[PDB]
Design a protein around this nucleic acid. Structure first.
Ligand SMILES: [Mg+2]
Lengths: 346, 346
RNA sequence: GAGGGUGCUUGUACACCCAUAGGGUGAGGUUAAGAAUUACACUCACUAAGUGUGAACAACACAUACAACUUGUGGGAUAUACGCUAAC
């Protein structure tokens, strides 16, 4: 079933917030050792859990589920590797194996050997002091008593204000991972955002137009969305017309005397299919327009129409022509009134 | 004595020799079943081998095999499929894993993942009663007590002599496989064919360069040959790419509600068309290069990969990019090793 | 009219067909609505295609010029192309 909360996966840049470069090098090598031990532990856990699962087929093997494996790996790596990271890795791998057990038994998928370059996971008990510093103009935190800062760069994307509510507590932080790539340290962070009931805000405006290059163009707030293309909308129509043309040409050069209905029923069918295709196109474009209005909570929509240059002359042609091409005004009004959107014709 | 033979893979189409279509469909269904069971068995083989290796590593750090893997795949798939396929699959996977054991423990490689669309193996013990039939104009042979006839058609020179060599026993067959594709059965045979003897003078050197506005330019002495044209490699491929992009844009409102396979049914054609086209053009160029080497009795050919102005800045580009674009070096190696011509890189 | 079928596999063209094939469906899954029912770049699968004989959507026979022929496969909305498999 669809969960009441959505999940967003992002990749922010985490950097050592320490003054001395020697401390930075120490933290870097300790992170690298962390990833090495994480790989070794993860491979050992996945193979051991496979052995415990496949006790039937391992007859030739010469001699809850958390405790034995986690403790064995712990005593193997006590003092040289943090314990909560092992706990998070073990929990994640057991979740994955419980998910893919059937596939592994049937033989569809082989056992994925986690390589040395795995993005090593970390739990909630490891991260600390996740607060936004205005003096540094960035987010800062403490991972396992190691200071760290965020270098989001020239990012205008959702990550910044995601972290804003995250430090504001509106978002629960899931089991996230630290990835190392080419000396760059990223935080593969999974945020759980509660799906608030999107209330159609009556005060925010939306403008929809019948452009020349795109059939529907919609503008709402600081976002613009194009709906289809002339080529996409016209490919099937051109195919239908070409089929009609070749059928008529073949019939005109075919054998007569067998009835005119047998000669033109294909042409009539092709005409009907062309009309039905355009109707389906109108339906799907209107559906996407209303859907975009729903997700942006645009409670007010205007069909800004034609009027431009105070009565300008006729151009080449308008894709979807006017608002009354295929009852398009009616279809949009219908889907709006079922959605809960007031409509103002323009 | 050194190896005087080079392994070559051949695709021989095989039709099913039963009178009516009910038996044909039954045997085709059984053959699909064979392929599916082979993929499952191969995956289980790889998982078991990796688990064995990691358990050995675990036991070493804390403080026969072929028979075992063959036995486990047997008892998992006895009676539903022939037995020779599983043994050859076992032996091949064991050879590959014994070769890559160090990398797999270290972690620089990912464990193999076999899918439902693989060729399944069979050894030289599968072919029985291989004889040319005069009434049916085909070679007939029984593979695991299943009759099969060869569909060569207009191949009165190439594969008709290689298989006529097999019945006499002059040419040896290594392990083969079988591919199944859209109602067609293909046999992928690995033949050990001796190298041709040609009059080659090692003193004469034919210079070939991956440069110019042509794909590969070769010359020696005073003769020159340009292998292919830009309009036949880059521009034609750009047409496939542009058609694919148009199809991808047009697939957002293609037939929806039927999964991503059908919504992308038109896109997938151009991914195989472009791959096949480039693999054929590289084949033709790689053959037209070794052809010029053979024609003037060139004993060794030099491949100068760029090396322009001893490390100069990047120009726009020259066709074919580098000397391993689409296995052009990997392909040139075998056409040189068989011919006895030495290959020089630079 | 693109693109496909048949002409051993791959490529170019070629004769005959198919082609709204970016289409027409079916099964499973998720979702909303009081319902009809919508949806699903969710999973999976089916379906058109040479000539003569032949009752037949059985089968058989016939069915082009040029070159290659170390292979199979996964991912790829705007990531520039990456990885798995056999062999030397
Ligand atoms: Mg064909």
């Amino acid at each position: 079933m669809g969960k009441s909360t959505l999940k967003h996966t992002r990749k922010i840049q985490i950097l050592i917030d320490l003054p001395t470069k020697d401390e930075k090098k120490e933290v870097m090598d300790m992170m690298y050792q962390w990833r090495d031990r994480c790989f070794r532990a993860a491979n050992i856990i996945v193979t051991h859990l496979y052995v415990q699962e496949m006790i039937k087929d391992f007859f030739y093997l010469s001699e809850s589920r958390m405790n034995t494996t986690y403790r064995v790996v712990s005593d193997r790596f006590k003092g040289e590797m943090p314990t909560n990271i092992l706990s998070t890795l073990n929990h994640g791998l057991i979740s994955s194996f419980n998910k893919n057990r059937v596939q592994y038994w049937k033989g569809e998928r082989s056992l994925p050997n986690f390589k040395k370059d795995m993005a090593f996971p970390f739990g909630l008990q490891g991260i600390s002091r996740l607060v936004y510093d205005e003096e540094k103009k960035a987010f800062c935190f403490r991972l396992y008593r190691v200071p760290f800062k965020t270098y989001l760069g020239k990012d205008f994307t959702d990550k910044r204000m995601l972290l804003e509510r995250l430090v504001k507590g509106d978002v629960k932080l899931c089991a996230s991972n630290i990835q190392l790539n080419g000396g760059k340290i990223f935080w593969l962070a999974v945020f759980e955002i509660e799906k608030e009931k999107h209330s159609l805000k009556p005060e925010v405006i939306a403008e929809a137009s019948l452009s020349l290059e795109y059939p529907i163009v919609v503008k709402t707030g600081k976002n613009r969305l194009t709906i289809g293309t002339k080529e996409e909308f016209l490919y099937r129509r051109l195919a239908i017309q070409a089929a009609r043309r070749r059928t008529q040409v073949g019939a005109t050069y075919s054998r007569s005397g067998k009835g005119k209905k047998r000669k033109l029923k294909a042409v009539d069918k092709y005409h009907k299919t062309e009309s039905n295709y355009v109707a389906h196109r109108i339906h799907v474009y209107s559906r996407k327009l209303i859907d975009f209005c729903i997700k942006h909570q645009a409670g007010t929509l205007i069909l800004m129409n034609q009027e431009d240059k105070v009565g300008i002359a006729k151009e080449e042609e308008f894709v979807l022509r006017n608002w009354s091409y295929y009852e398009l005004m009616t279809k949009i009004k219908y889907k709006a009134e079922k959605a809960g959107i007031e409509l103002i014709i323009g």
